[PDB]
A paper describes a structure:
Similarly, we also show that the Y453F substitution in the RBD of mink spike, a structure of which we also report here, only increases affinity for human ACE2 if residue 614 is a glycine but not if it is an aspartic acid.
The SARS-CoV-2 spike glycoprotein is the major surface antigen of the virus. Its function is to bind the host receptor ACE2 and mediate the subsequent membrane fusion required for cell entry. Here we have examined the structures and receptor-binding properties of spikes of the B.1.1.7 variant first described in Kent, United Kingdom (now termed Alpha)10,16–19 and the B.1.351 variant first described in South Africa (now termed Beta).
Residue numbers in the entry:
A (entry chain D): 19 to 133, 141 to 613
B (entry chain A): 322 to 555, 574 to 590
Write the structure that this text describes.
């Protein structure tokens, strides 16, 4: 009869037909990953081809239902998800050219040698532990001069092809296509816009500049001791001394920048070894931690089907920590586990992912995913955040029950956390701003590197050691840039993580500093979380966010409240040192 | 109340519960089997205490009492469904199975038994041998079976017998694998319906019957209904064995 009723019938048929195909494709993928042979690759390729062909045909079928007729707002979401054209709007020759460009860029990034040394792990070890100016400069410059020079011509055609594809789908540019994820419309009082994500990110960043400036000044003052005359007390930090190839993470700078080096950290690896933990107690303890909050247990097949240890010498597998949701009520974890603290925290992270995947399994097929990009990883991360506290360790049994907690230990812990969390927001913000500007056409093709380095000096406070001409492509050296991955999901995730943590700690009635908060043995926090987890993609991300923190937008105040002792100590320490950087100074 | 007497028919054959429950192959839910079991003595105590059933829910009867009641007829309906759909096998519920596949009336007297079958109906790859009806114009009336395979039309355009745009084949298959969840695993369901009519009772429990007395005030239990009084050969009960008619008199 009406368009809505026919759409509902079509959606029933599609869901029933699609669940089994997705399950079979996932089974083939798991079979290849656990057992690497030449037979399994063909099975993966065939299953993927079948699934892709089915999805394309069903999208073409679903395009026939006009979207103005449906007013249910839940049928409309699934029809909108199916109706997306994608890159098929391009001509056959243009599509082949775009796919060839992407494959060539990925292949050339993957196969890169410096003469020889590969990036993994020959160059990474040099950039992580050289402690020598000349060697670090050579390693930093050679990789750029090879890859960025070899990748510059391809990116220029990539940009215009992607812009044509995005403008064909009624968007302004490809950056607008990326921003379309954070969009809510048709709901009164919870609206959001693609152009509103340009704002609400700058606003959040202008509230982080004091803390980052103090951290940068402290790190520069501490790093000046290692290299006597290569760093200026008013200039920026050279790009090849930040403990990374790109400077994305400052974690490797922890060894030089320790507040109190005499006092060690909390490492419970020896306690785990002496108590004879054997890669199965870790996941049982994680399950206990998740149950104590009120969330359910692991399913019966999770224990027997999943892989929690290396296959052995005879069987080879690519075992990175991963949580698999194969469909039809099948959840597993693929991971090689050894007895350390890092694996103990990764178990909680992966089970946070798994418990997120269990909640919205009652939603239709197309609405079984997180509310937006940052919700899934933030939910995963808060569990690992709460499971590492000394109180939680003492309650479990590992770490002595008469541990001495003082100011020095918490300052060391907070600095180690901020060298990873705070030190990466400016990089993400600057890189995504540059990509958006390039896509929008505001940056001309002849002023790419100049604008990139000017933005890096003005925002990140980092200068280049040697000048780079327009034949270089420094941004393409990053894995995400050349491999076509969105990068703003590492900003909203960081903000949502602390918003969720503060809301849950307010639900658990914890008194004191936020960084000592623990969420175990509390069921109200579990209910508050599960009210949002079960929603899936059915409700707007603003509404799902409101169910935990009570706000319709992301805030930076929890992030600054987490790091208050560190901010006060840094402000005390930087009384003599200069705060801020000057863009005129250069190493040459 | 000097004596107590109970009178039941002298049937000795055992009911074929094993043939229904121990069956080699079951049936699709859209085309479910019906078996009538009669002229036998039924012992539901062993069936209840077998303790191998995930679901044993009796509506309108008591689980222990029904052992000594006499029913005119007993019907058993057997099929296979998904683990999550067993919820819909109950009076006054809605769903794809309770609307288009199998409907139980609200005034239902009987029992529902369901047990897991993952070790028999699941194979590597997939079963794809158990179907169920997905589309239908109208809901199924209680205890009605539909086995037509006509093409369902969703729009105004006529189907002309070949599927296409807004033309679907209703019967879609169940896919069972040994790695699924509990809610996606096969379950075998047997529904027992007890029918009482004005005809003499035929299916009864295993309760021994004693001799009858007359002209004295005794407690009698005929074919399930009890009373106290004097039985006189002639408010009126007809005993099963000796075909006599007795009148009940207050004492
Ligand atoms: C892995 O594959 C090899 C050959 O394909 C086979 O011999 C072996 O049994 C497989 N192992 C598992 C655990 O499937
Ligand atoms: C949308 O349709 C679903 C069934 O598909 C129904 O449960 C829901 O109430 C409908 N919403 C509105 C607003 O009509
Ligand atoms: C997808 O492309 C087809 C091609 O003509 C067009 O008719 C349709 O409106 C497009 N839909 C969307 C959502 O872009
Ligand atoms: C949680 O409660 C249990 C008692 O069931 C107790 O043994 C454990 O120490 C508690 N842990 C925390 C962190 O409060
Ligand atoms: C069915 O088979 C089992 C296994 O042999 C047996 O114990 C049982 O008595 C049989 N009949 C019923 C009604 O369960
Ligand atoms: C059972 O009862 C019937 C009723 O008339 C009778 O004909 C038959 O002989 C009885 N059988 C036995 C073994 O008592
Ligand atoms: Zn994660």
């Amino acid at each position: 009869s009406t368009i809505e009723e026919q759409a509902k019938t079509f959606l029933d048929k599609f869901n029933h037909e699609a669940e089994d195909l997705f399950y079979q494709s996932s089974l083939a993928s798991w079979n290849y990953n656990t057992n690497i042979t030449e037979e399994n690759v063909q099975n993966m390729n065939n299953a993927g081809d079948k699934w892709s062909a089915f999805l394309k045909e069903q999208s073409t079928l679903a395009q026939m239902y006009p979207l103005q007729e449906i007013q249910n707002l839940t049928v409309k979401l699934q029809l909108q998800a199916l109706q997306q054209n994608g890159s098929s709007v391009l001509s056959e020759d243009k599509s082949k050219r775009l796919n060839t460009i992407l494959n060539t860029m990925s292949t050339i990034y993957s196969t890169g040698k410096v003469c020889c040394l590969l990036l993994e792990p020959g160059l990474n070890e040099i950039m992580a532990n050289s402690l020598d100016y000349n060697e670090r400069l050579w390693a930093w410059e050679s990789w750029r001069s090879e890859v960025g020079k070899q990748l510059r011509p391809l990116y220029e055609e990539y940009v215009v092809l992607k812009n044509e594809m995005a403008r064909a789908n009624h968007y302004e540019d490809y950056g607008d296509y990326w921003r379309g994820d954070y969009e809510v419309n048709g709901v009164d009082g919870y609206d959001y816009s693609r152009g509103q994500l340009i704002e609400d990110v700058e606003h959040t960043f202008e509230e982080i500049k004091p803390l980052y400036e103090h951290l940068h000044a402290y790190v520069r003052a501490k790093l000046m001791n290692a290299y006597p005359s290569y760093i200026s007390p008013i200039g920026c930090l050279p790009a090849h001394l930040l403990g990374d190839m790109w400077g994305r993470f400052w974690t490797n700078l922890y060894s030089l920048t320790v507040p109190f080096g005499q006092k060690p950290n909390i490492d419970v690896t020896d306690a785990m070894v002496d108590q004879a933990w054997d890669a199965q107690r870790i996941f049982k303890e994680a399950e206990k931690f998740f149950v104590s909050v009120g969330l359910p247990n692991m399913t019966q097949g999770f224990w027997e089907n999943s892989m929690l240890t290396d296959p052995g010498n005879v069987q080879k597998a690519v075992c990175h920590p991963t949580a698999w949701d194969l469909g039809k009520g099948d959840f597993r974890i693929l991971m090689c586990t050894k007895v350390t603290m890092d694996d103990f925290l990764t178990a909680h992270h992966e089970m946070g992912h798994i418990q997120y995947d269990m909640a919205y399994a009652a939603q239709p097929f197309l609405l079984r995913n997180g509310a937006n990009e940052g919700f899934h990883e933030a939910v995963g991360e808060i569990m690992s955040l709460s499971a590492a506290t000394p109180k939680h360790l003492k309650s479990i049994g590992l770490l002595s029950p008469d541990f001495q907690e003082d100011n020095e230990t918490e300052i060391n812990f907070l600095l180690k956390q901020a060298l990873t969390i705070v030190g990466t927001l400016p990089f993400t913000y600057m890189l995504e701003k540059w990509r958006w500007m390039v896509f929008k056409g505001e940056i001309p093709k002849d002023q790419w590197m100049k604008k990139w380095w000017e933005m890096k000096r003005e925002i990140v406070g980092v200068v280049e050691p040697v000048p780079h001409d327009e034949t270089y492509c420094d941004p393409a050296s990053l894995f995400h840039v050349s491999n076509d991955y969105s990068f703003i999901r590492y900003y909203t995730r960081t903000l949502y993580q602390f918003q969720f943590q503060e809301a849950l700690c307010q639900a658990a009635k914890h008194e004191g500093p936020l960084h000592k908060c623990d969420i175990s043995n509390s069921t109200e926090a579990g209910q508050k979380l599960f009210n949002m987890l079960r929603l899936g993609k059915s409700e707007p991300w603003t509404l799902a966010l409101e169910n935990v923190v009570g706000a319709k937008n992301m805030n930076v105040r929890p992030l600054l409240n987490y790091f208050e002792p560190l901010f006060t100590w840094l402000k005390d320490q930087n009384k003599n040192s200069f705060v801020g950087w000057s863009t005129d100074w250069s190493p040459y | 109340p000097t004596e107590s007497i109970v009178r039941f028919p002298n049937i000795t054959n055992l009911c074929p519960f094993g043939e229904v429950f121990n069956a080699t192959r079951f049936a699709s839910v859209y085309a479910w089997n019906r078996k009538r079991i009669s002229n036998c003595v039924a012992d539901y105590s062993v069936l209840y205490n077998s303790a191998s059933f995930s679901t044993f829910k009796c509506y309108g009867v008591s689980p222990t009492k029904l052992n000594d009641l006499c029913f005119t007829n007993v019907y058993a309906d057997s099929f296979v469904i998904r683990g999550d759909e067993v919820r819909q096998i109950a009076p006054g519920q809605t769903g794809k199975i309770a609307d288009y596949n199998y409907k139980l009336p609200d005034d239902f007297t009987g029992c529902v038994i369901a047990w897991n079958s993952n070790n028999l109906d699941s194979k590597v790859g997939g079963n794809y041998n158990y179907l169920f009806r997905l589309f239908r114009k109208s809901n199924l009336k209680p205890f009605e079976r539909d086995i037509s395979t006509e093409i369902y039309q969703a729009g105004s355009t006529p189907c002309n017998g070949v599927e296409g745009f807004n033309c679907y084949f209703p019967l879609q298959s169940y896919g069972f694998q040994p790695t699924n969840g509990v809610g996606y695993q096969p379950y075998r369901v047997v529904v027992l319906s007890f029918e009482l009519l004005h005809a003499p009772a035929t299916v009864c429990g295993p309760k021994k019957s004693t001799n009858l007395v007359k002209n004295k005030c005794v407690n009698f239990n005929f074919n399930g209904l009890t009373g106290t009084g004097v039985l006189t050969e002639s408010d009126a009960v007809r005993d099963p064995q000796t075909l006599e008619i007795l009148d009940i008199t207050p004492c």
